[PDB]
Amino acid sequence: GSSGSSGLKILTPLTDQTVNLGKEICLKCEISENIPGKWTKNGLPVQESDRLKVVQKGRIHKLVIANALTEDEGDYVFAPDAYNVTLPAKVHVISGPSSG
């Protein structure tokens, strides 16, 4: 999908993930290249923290959350720090006893 002087082939793109409130979020994606990338939610630079840890394995980016918070519900998007490619993703969180 050459668009702008790029040539990255998405081997294993992100897959829609749906879990209940609290569950441990997970998002793994592979690419035909070995380069670092960043994640973005609802069009914003996701924040990192003890709970939020972005693990990377060679040509694969993994992302899991300690507790699936309501905020999670939205649209996740990842992109390499070398190319201008973007991998869209959908997620949903089920309500629970923890509300109000």
Sign for the CA dihedral angle at 65, 18, 44, 86 comes to positive
According to the entry, how was the structure determined?
Answer: NMR
Domain residue limits at 10: 1-100
Q: Which residues contact 46 (CB under 8 A, 6 or more apart)?
A: 38, 39, 40, 52
Q: What is the CATH number of the domain that holds 97?
A: 2.60.40.10
Sequential DSSP letters for the chain: --SSS-----SB----EEEETTS---EEEE-SS---EEEEETTEEPPP-SSEEEEE-SSEEEEEESS--GGG-SEEEEEESSS---EEEEEEEE--S---
44 forms bridges with which residues in the sheet?
Answer: 41
Q: Could you tell me the two tokens for 65?
A: 């959350």
- Looking only at the bridges linking them, the beta strands covering 44-45 and 17-20 are unpaired
Q: How many domains does the chain have?
A: 1
Is the CB of residue 65 less than 8 Å from the CB of residue 27?
Answer: no
Residue that has been written with the tokens 């959350």 in this structure: 65
Q: How many other CB atoms are there within 10 angstroms of residue 14's CB atom?
A: 21
Q: Which residues contact 57 (CB under 8 A, 6 or more apart)?
A: none
Phi, psi of 74 (to 5 degrees): 170, -135
Is the CB of residue 64 less than 8 Å from the CB of residue 24?
Answer: yes
